[PDB]
Each structure stands twice: as C-alpha cells, then as structure tokens.
C-alpha cells in the first residue's frame, strides 16, 4: 500500500526485477559491480 | 428493562469510548514516526538507480 | 578546497558535510579522495573510513561494507547496515525457506478467496 495522503491508502502492484557523456573508472570488474548493485537496489525497494 | 442495567451499559460504552479516542492519537504519532522513517531511505535508492542507469548505458 | 560528502545507509544517514580528504578501504587497496578527482565506482570491504576537515582531521566512521562513487564535485558513500558475506546471508535464506508455513497443499485455483473477500468488503462499509 502506497501513502497517497493521511486519508488514502492505495493498493498497487509494482514490478521489481525488469528495470553526461563521461565514464566511471572501475576499481574491480564492473560486471561484479552490476551484480552487487542490482541486488542492493531490489533490497532497498522492498524495504521502502 | 430497569434503569440500572441501562446505566451500567452506558458506563461501559463510555469507558470504551475514551480509550478508542486515545488510541486514534497513538496511531497519529506512530504514523508520523513511520513517515520520518519513510523519508530517510530515498537518497540511497535514487543514487543507486542513477548509477545503475548510467552503467547500463 | 572542499567537496561535499555523504555517507548514506539504506535506512538512515550517517554523514553529510564538506570535507577535504577521504581515506577508504577499496576492493583492491586502500585509496584516498581529493576534490577534482576522477569519477570512480568501487566496492568496499568492512573497516573504518577516515574523513579529514579543517580541525576535524580524524573524523572516523566505521562502515561494514558497501560502495563508493566519486564525481569531481560530489562524493557518495553508499554503506551497509551489516557485513555482507555468504555465511551470514545464506543462513538468513535458509531461515526464510524453513519458516514458510505450509498447512495444506492447495492447487491455487480456488474460488473461496472472493467468496470470503466480497462479504468482508461489504461488511467494512457498515462500520464507517
């Protein structure tokens, strides 16, 4: 349920798993960085 | 029937009514506490999503 | 020369403020951040992270892991509430598998959900 206002609770269904021209340096492989950061994003969305 | 048992039911529903009026205010305070816990988790997730949408492109 | 730094946990905040120099334990070795640094994303092992200011040159915060992201005007440490290793996380996955209470092995295609739910939905508006 999403908090619309103090009087309104809206039951929703929301998708999780299917989700300036410079580049970040990557200290590990960036593949394992993507493998970590997507898992932490799913955990933050479920906690919110 | 008689007025004594009606008087005792009036006293019972009044003693229920006071504390339901109190626990409405308790639910207001816990709603505001859950709102300040709602407001703190967002700048983690917007920075993670911006980093993900940069790294995928 | 000062650069804004945040250390932001998934539940709350740990640090927000201007700094000059940040030492953090990176995924390959211990590294440091200045203003004007290159953009950088790196995994972090658990340990103390040291932050330097004018007068507050030894501002130490203990961080149990996470990630670091450097922009030349913005430092973002995205931290961890607990140490992320497989011996702690696999036991939570096994406790999540074991605590699934299964009383009857239903097919899932039952009608009785709506037969309880429409009656309980019509009963709620007699109260308000």
């Amino acid at each position: 349920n999403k908090f619309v206002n103090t009087m309104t609770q809206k039951p929703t269904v929301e998708q999780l798993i299917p989700l300036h021209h410079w580049d970040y340096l990557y200290e590990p492989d960036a593949k394992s960085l993507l493998d970590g950061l997507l898992v932490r994003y799913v955990e933050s969305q479920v906690y919110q | 029937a008689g007025a004594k048992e009606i008087r005792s039911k009036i006293a019972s529903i009044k003693s229920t009514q006071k504390i339901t009026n109190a626990m409405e205010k308790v639910a207001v305070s816990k709603m505001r506490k859950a709102q300040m816990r709602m407001a703190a988790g967002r700048p983690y997730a917007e920075r993670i999503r911006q980093v993900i949408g940069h790294l995928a492109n | 020369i000062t650069v804004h730094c945040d250390i932001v946990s998934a539940e709350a905040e740990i640090f927000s403020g201007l700094v000059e120099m940040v030492i953090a334990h990176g995924a390959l070795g211990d590294l440091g951040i200045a203003p004007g640094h290159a953009p950088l994303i790196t995994d972090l092992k658990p340990g103390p992270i040291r932050l330097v200011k004018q007068g507050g040159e030894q501002e130490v915060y203990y961080i149990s892991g996470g990630f670091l992201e450097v922009q030349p005007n913005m430092v973002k440490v995205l931290a961890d509430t607990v140490v992320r290793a497989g011996d702690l996380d696999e036991a939570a996955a096994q406790e999540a598998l074991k605590a699934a209470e299964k009383a009857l092995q239903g097919k899932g295609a039952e009608f009785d959900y709506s037969a309880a739910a429409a009656r309980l939905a019509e009963a709620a508006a007699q109260l308000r």
Side-chain angles (χ1 to χ4, degrees), chain C residues 110-117:
Chain C
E110 302 88 5
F111 195 60
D112 281 9
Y113 307 89
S114 212

mmCIF file of all heavy atoms in Angstrom, chain C residues 110-117:
data_model
loop_
_atom_site.group_PDB
_atom_site.id
_atom_site.type_symbol
_atom_site.label_atom_id
_atom_site.label_comp_id
_atom_site.label_asym_id
_atom_site.label_seq_id
_atom_site.Cartn_x
_atom_site.Cartn_y
_atom_site.Cartn_z
ATOM 1 N N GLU C 110 -8.530 -21.845 -6.381
ATOM 2 C CA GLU C 110 -9.773 -21.895 -5.622
ATOM 3 C C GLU C 110 -10.602 -20.624 -5.804
ATOM 4 O O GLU C 110 -10.093 -19.559 -6.161
ATOM 5 C CB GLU C 110 -9.505 -22.126 -4.126
ATOM 6 C CG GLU C 110 -8.719 -23.399 -3.752
ATOM 7 C CD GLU C 110 -7.207 -23.234 -3.755
ATOM 8 O OE1 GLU C 110 -6.728 -22.101 -3.958
ATOM 9 O OE2 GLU C 110 -6.497 -24.241 -3.551
ATOM 10 N N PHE C 111 -11.908 -20.766 -5.564
ATOM 11 C CA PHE C 111 -12.880 -19.681 -5.648
ATOM 12 C C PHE C 111 -13.145 -19.021 -4.293
ATOM 13 O O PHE C 111 -13.737 -17.936 -4.248
ATOM 14 C CB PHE C 111 -14.188 -20.237 -6.248
ATOM 15 C CG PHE C 111 -15.159 -19.187 -6.730
ATOM 16 C CD1 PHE C 111 -14.785 -18.279 -7.724
ATOM 17 C CD2 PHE C 111 -16.438 -19.101 -6.171
ATOM 18 C CE1 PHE C 111 -15.676 -17.302 -8.169
ATOM 19 C CE2 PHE C 111 -17.342 -18.128 -6.605
ATOM 20 C CZ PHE C 111 -16.957 -17.228 -7.607
ATOM 21 N N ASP C 112 -12.651 -19.622 -3.199
ATOM 22 C CA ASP C 112 -13.081 -19.268 -1.841
ATOM 23 C C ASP C 112 -12.496 -17.941 -1.355
ATOM 24 O O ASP C 112 -12.999 -17.379 -0.364
ATOM 25 C CB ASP C 112 -12.706 -20.395 -0.878
ATOM 26 C CG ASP C 112 -13.676 -21.564 -0.934
ATOM 27 O OD1 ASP C 112 -14.546 -21.582 -1.830
ATOM 28 O OD2 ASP C 112 -13.559 -22.475 -0.089
ATOM 29 N N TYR C 113 -11.425 -17.466 -2.026
ATOM 30 C CA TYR C 113 -10.834 -16.142 -1.800
ATOM 31 C C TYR C 113 -11.846 -15.023 -2.016
ATOM 32 O O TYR C 113 -12.044 -14.176 -1.138
ATOM 33 C CB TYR C 113 -9.654 -15.903 -2.751
ATOM 34 C CG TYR C 113 -8.533 -16.923 -2.818
ATOM 35 C CD1 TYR C 113 -8.590 -18.008 -3.705
ATOM 36 C CD2 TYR C 113 -7.373 -16.745 -2.060
ATOM 37 C CE1 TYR C 113 -7.535 -18.926 -3.786
ATOM 38 C CE2 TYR C 113 -6.313 -17.643 -2.135
ATOM 39 C CZ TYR C 113 -6.405 -18.730 -2.994
ATOM 40 O OH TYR C 113 -5.354 -19.615 -3.058
ATOM 41 N N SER C 114 -12.527 -15.036 -3.167
ATOM 42 C CA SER C 114 -13.504 -13.999 -3.485
ATOM 43 C C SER C 114 -14.791 -14.164 -2.686
ATOM 44 O O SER C 114 -15.451 -13.163 -2.379
ATOM 45 C CB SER C 114 -13.802 -14.007 -4.984
ATOM 46 O OG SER C 114 -14.102 -12.704 -5.451
ATOM 47 N N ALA C 115 -15.127 -15.404 -2.308
ATOM 48 C CA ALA C 115 -16.327 -15.665 -1.516
ATOM 49 C C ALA C 115 -16.163 -15.194 -0.076
ATOM 50 O O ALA C 115 -17.147 -14.822 0.576
ATOM 51 C CB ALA C 115 -16.669 -17.154 -1.555
ATOM 52 N N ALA C 116 -14.931 -15.198 0.442
ATOM 53 C CA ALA C 116 -14.710 -14.524 1.718
ATOM 54 C C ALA C 116 -14.519 -13.017 1.536
ATOM 55 O O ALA C 116 -14.982 -12.224 2.371
ATOM 56 C CB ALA C 116 -13.507 -15.133 2.435
ATOM 57 N N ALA C 117 -13.884 -12.611 0.427
ATOM 58 C CA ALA C 117 -13.405 -11.239 0.278
ATOM 59 C C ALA C 117 -14.525 -10.263 -0.064
ATOM 60 O O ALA C 117 -14.480 -9.108 0.365
ATOM 61 C CB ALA C 117 -12.308 -11.184 -0.784
#
